[PDB]
Amino acid sequence: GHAAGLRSGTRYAFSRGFRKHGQIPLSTYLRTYRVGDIVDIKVNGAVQKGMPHKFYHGKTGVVYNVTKSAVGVIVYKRVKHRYIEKRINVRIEHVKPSRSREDFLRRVKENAELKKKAKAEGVPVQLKRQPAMPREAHTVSIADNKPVTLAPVAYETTI
Amino acid sequence: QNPMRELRIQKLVLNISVGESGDRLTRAAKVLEQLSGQTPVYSKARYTVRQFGIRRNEKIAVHVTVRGPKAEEILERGLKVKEYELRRRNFSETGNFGFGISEHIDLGIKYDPSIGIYGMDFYCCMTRPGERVAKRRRCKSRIGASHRITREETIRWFKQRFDGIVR
Amino acid sequence: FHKLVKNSAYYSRFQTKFKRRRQGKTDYYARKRLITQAKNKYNAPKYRLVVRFTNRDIITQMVTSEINGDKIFAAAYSHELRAYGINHGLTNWAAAYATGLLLARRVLAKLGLDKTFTGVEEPNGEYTLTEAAETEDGERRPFKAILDVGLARTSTGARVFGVMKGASDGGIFIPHSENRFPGYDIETEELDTEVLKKYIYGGHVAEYMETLADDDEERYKSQFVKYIEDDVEADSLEELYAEAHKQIRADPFRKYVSDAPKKSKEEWKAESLKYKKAKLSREERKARVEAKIKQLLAEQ
RNA sequence: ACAUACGACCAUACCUAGUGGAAAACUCGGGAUCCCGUCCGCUCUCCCAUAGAUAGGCCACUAAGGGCGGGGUUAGUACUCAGGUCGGUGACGACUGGGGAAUCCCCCGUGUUGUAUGU
RNA sequence: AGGUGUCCUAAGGGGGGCUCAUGGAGAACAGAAAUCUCCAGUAGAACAAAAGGGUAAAAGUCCCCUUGAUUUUGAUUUUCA
RNA sequence: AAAGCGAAUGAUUAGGGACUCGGGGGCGAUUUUUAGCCUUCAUCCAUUCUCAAACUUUAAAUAUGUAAGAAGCCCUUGUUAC
Ligand SMILES: [K+]
Ligand SMILES: [K+]
Ligand SMILES: [K+]
Ligand SMILES: [K+]
Ligand SMILES: [K+]
Ligand SMILES: [K+]
Ligand SMILES: [K+]
Ligand SMILES: [K+]
Ligand SMILES: [K+]
Ligand SMILES: [K+]
Ligand SMILES: [Mg+2]
Ligand SMILES: [Mg+2]
Ligand SMILES: [Mg+2]
Ligand SMILES: [Mg+2]
Ligand SMILES: [Mg+2]
Ligand SMILES: [Mg+2]
Ligand SMILES: [Mg+2]
Ligand SMILES: [Mg+2]
Ligand SMILES: [Mg+2]
Numbered sequence: 001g002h003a004a005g006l007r008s009g010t011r012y013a014f015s016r017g018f019r020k021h022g023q024i025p026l027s028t029y030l031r032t033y034r035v036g037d038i039v040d041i042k043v044n045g046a047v048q049k050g051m052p053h054k055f056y057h058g059k060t061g062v063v064y065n066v067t068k069s070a071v072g073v074i075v076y077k078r079v080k081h082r083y084i085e086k087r088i089n090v091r092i093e094h095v096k097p098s099r100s101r102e103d104f105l106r107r108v109k110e111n112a113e114l115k116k117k118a119k120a121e122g123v124p125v126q127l128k129r130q131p132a133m134p135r136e137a138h139t140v141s142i143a144d145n146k147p148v149t150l151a152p153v154a155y156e157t158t159i
Numbered sequence: 160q161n162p163m164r165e166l167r168i169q170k171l172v173l174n175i176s177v178g179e180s181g182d183r184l185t186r187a188a189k190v191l192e193q194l195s196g197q198t199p200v201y202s203k204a205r206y207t208v209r210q211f212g213i214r215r216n217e218k219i220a221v222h223v224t225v226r227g228p229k230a231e232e233i234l235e236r237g238l239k240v241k242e243y244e245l246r247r248r249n250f251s252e253t254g255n256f257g258f259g260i261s262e263h264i265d266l267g268i269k270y271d272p273s274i275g276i277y278g279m280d281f282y283c284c285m286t287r288p289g290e291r292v293a294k295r296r297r298c299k300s301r302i303g304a305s306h307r308i309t310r311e312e313t314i315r316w317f318k319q320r321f322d323g324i325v326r
Numbered sequence: 327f328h329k330l331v332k333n334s335a336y337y338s339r340f341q342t343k344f345k346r347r348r349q350g351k352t353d354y355y356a357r358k359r360l361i362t363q364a365k366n367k368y369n370a371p372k373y374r375l376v377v378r379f380t381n382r383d384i385i386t387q388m389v390t391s392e393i394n395g396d397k398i399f400a401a402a403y404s405h406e407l408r409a410y411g412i413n414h415g416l417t418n419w420a421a422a423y424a425t426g427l428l429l430a431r432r433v434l435a436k437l438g439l440d441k442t443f444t445g446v447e448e449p450n451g452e453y454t455l456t457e458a459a460e461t462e463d464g465e466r467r468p469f470k471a472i473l474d475v476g477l478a479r480t481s482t483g484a485r486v487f488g489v490m491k492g493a494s495d496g497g498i499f500i501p502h503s504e505n506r507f508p509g510y511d512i513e514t515e516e517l518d519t520e521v522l523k524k525y526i527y528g529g530h531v532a533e534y535m536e537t538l539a540d541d542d543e544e545r546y547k548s549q550f551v552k553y554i555e556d557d558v559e560a561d562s563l564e565e566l567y568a569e570a571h572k573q574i575r576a577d578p579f580r581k582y583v584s585d586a587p588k589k590s591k592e593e594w595k596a597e598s599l600k601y602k603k604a605k606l607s608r609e610e611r612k613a614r615v616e617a618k619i620k621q622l623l624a625e626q
Numbered sequence: 627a628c629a630u631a632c633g634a635c636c637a638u639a640c641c642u643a644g645u646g647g648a649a650a651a652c653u654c655g656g657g658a659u660c661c662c663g664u665c666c667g668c669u670c671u672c673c674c675a676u677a678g679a680u681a682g683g684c685c686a687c688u689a690a691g692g693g694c695g696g697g698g699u700u701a702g703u704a705c706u707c708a709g710g711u712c713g714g715u716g717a718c719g720a721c722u723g724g725g726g727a728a729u730c731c732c733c734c735g736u737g738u739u740g741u742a743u744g745u
Numbered sequence: 746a747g748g749u750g751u752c753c754u755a756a757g758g759g760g761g762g763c764u765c766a767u768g769g770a771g772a773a774c775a776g777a778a779a780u781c782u783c784c785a786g787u788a789g790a791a792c793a794a795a796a797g798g799g800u801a802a803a804a805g806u807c808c809c810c811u812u813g814a815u816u817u818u819g820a821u822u823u824u825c826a
Numbered sequence: 827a828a829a830g831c832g833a834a835u836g837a838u839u840a841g842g843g844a845c846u847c848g849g850g851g852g853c854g855a856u857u858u859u860u861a862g863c864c865u866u867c868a869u870c871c872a873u874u875c876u877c878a879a880a881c882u883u884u885a886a887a888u889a890u891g892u893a894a895g896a897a898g899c900c901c902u903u904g905u906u907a908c
Contacts, residue, residue, distance in 0.1 A: 019341045029362040060892040068364040163681040176780040220780045251771040253783045259773035292683045297477045298350045306682045327870040337693040395633045398742040483661035598627040
């Protein structure tokens, strides 16, 4: 049985970067969170209270509780042949709102106006994404862009 | 030049390093207390060397500082004993200087046989008006390059005011 | 010789501090505890009463904090006391009490709670706190703010607590204890409640006048030059401030005009742009180097 | 546009040296009765806004300045995922379908901005 | 390559002021090394102990007041069935 | 992984410039710090040849967390001891 402590193996993960020590920006304490938000976890080494375990560093979850100085988050952990639901308490210095769902929240309101604009006008539109398609036919002119002929080069010693 | 670039005496501090504790230190404190009129301050020993016979955290010295007209008159008396002659190397690169004497009764203190005889050290600090910039608590900053004193200026000031000689 | 500490490698690894800490203006350790609010209360603001002192002025504000900067809710300077009968001693304890009272009335009027929450109206040196007022058979809690003192020392008798005492009598609720007011005896832990009354109306200045005039007439007239030119004596200061107090609680939005030059916003911009020097260009900067080479080369 | 108070990003803002600063502001500044604190009214605290000066703090400009920030070159190179009854005694290497860096060196730049009150 | 079966009424809790290791230049005895003064100084010091992380108007250092090292039970995290 | 050391911490080869009061040896009277004439190590400065599982300013490939709607989006306004 090897050594297995709470913070074993976190030499580089929990460290602050080069030229990024000292004071914490105060906009961290001014954000607001609501039950149902989507946040990601990133441990700050300079705060030793409300720290999450090293497994959750770099994960994304959903808020389920709000208290005076922390939030409760729900994450799913894989243990061999199943998933288990975990609930962790994290101080707000370690959490951050996520941009994972912003693309979806932007397409939903853009689809609403395009649908209503088209319905008012009378011409149908697409309203869903498509993967990149193969290119089409086109003509390329040789005028004042004459091609340059290349050939492989002989071997030579550099040093 | 500008009226705000005139030299003056910031403070004068004198210390006596007896090297041991006991009655000798107490009597070394009385001479400074009588001379200045203020209560002096004891200084302990940071190191511990058996060659000098001192250990950590035992008082071995006494000092005190004065400002204003009191500093000027006491500085005058010491220069009188030194008969207004000083060495060039007594002046530092920041614009200060100092000297010392081997006997405290030379100034004239009505010698008492029950207090012994001590020597002391003289050191005074020069300055200019507007030095509060680097000393205030709020918006503390750094004095400019053209506003600081040099060795040539302070020796010249000493020769004009006290009419002394430095070589 | 010795190693040069400040070489290029020293500069490369150097990490600067926050800009307003380099300027020495804000204490970020205290600021965090002042502005942060419980996440249980989602968007309820926290109101700060900041007070700052200059050589010739007193600055007072009511502030809230946002993500991209602070927002000012009201302001009340000390030079604005001129249009109330006060012209001297603009940075003393009595002026601090008056300019604090001005902001409290100016804030309550903006919120619409001026008719209720009057305050004290008879400045007395007692220790009281603003209570809830009963209206239409119901209670309403008073407006609440906290003091922000900056880098000043909080010793007994400081002028920062003078501004607070005025705002508290103005009608705002500001939590505090009385062990920092002038006239508090730390030995018996009692407040005299009369020395504080003297300080509210500026009585400590007046007693200085009469004592100084009796024992040193030359210093008296050199330090109170502008006080005597307007026939202000030691028996008139108390009624002078009490007059300003009741005028302030009748029209807190009175306008003041100074004797400095007056222009418009567009006029000032045109004036300032004339005294402005522009940076060189690349061609000019290169031509200067070429000229410098010719000078040094021909200098030999 | 300029100044002050409270800020946001936290060096394009830092460090060194040299020249300038309309108006107002900010500053240095003057005095220790009271509140208060020191070995010392140096710092902190109180009183005056008259007198003096932009000397310094503060703002702006300069320097083939050190650092910092952005880009080029290094280079389709080093490395790496998948493949073959491929080469070679081996060490190790080439090819097929893909992904793809970092110094030395060269060029440019030297803060942006929110609320409130004023010049 | 190393560590543990302890140690602390403060080396626990709150508040306030200050800045460290080291270098240069100066001062009677005093010198390589005693005490005093100025300038530079991104932490090169200190934080009971092994090593790693963290900290500059502090988490270091000195000063003032105290016992949240207290009461009643539940939820959650690591090793994990 | 690769890369770096005219970048911090460590390891490491060689010349040059500045220096004397740091040391050593000496030569003009060893006179003498007279830094007189040299001299070698030492120190500082700009360069120079090689390195790191328990070093690092930088930094891949392969792998890895979350999302891609009806239990969604928008307008108005009812309860509470928070
Ligand atoms: K192990
Ligand atoms: K100036
Ligand atoms: K100037
Ligand atoms: K032990
Ligand atoms: K304690
Ligand atoms: K450590
Ligand atoms: K357990
Ligand atoms: K590299
Ligand atoms: K190295
Ligand atoms: K991904
Ligand atoms: Mg392990
Ligand atoms: Mg703990
Ligand atoms: Mg504080
Ligand atoms: Mg440059
Ligand atoms: Mg392969
Ligand atoms: Mg096969
Ligand atoms: Mg403590
Ligand atoms: Mg502290
Ligand atoms: Mg490698």
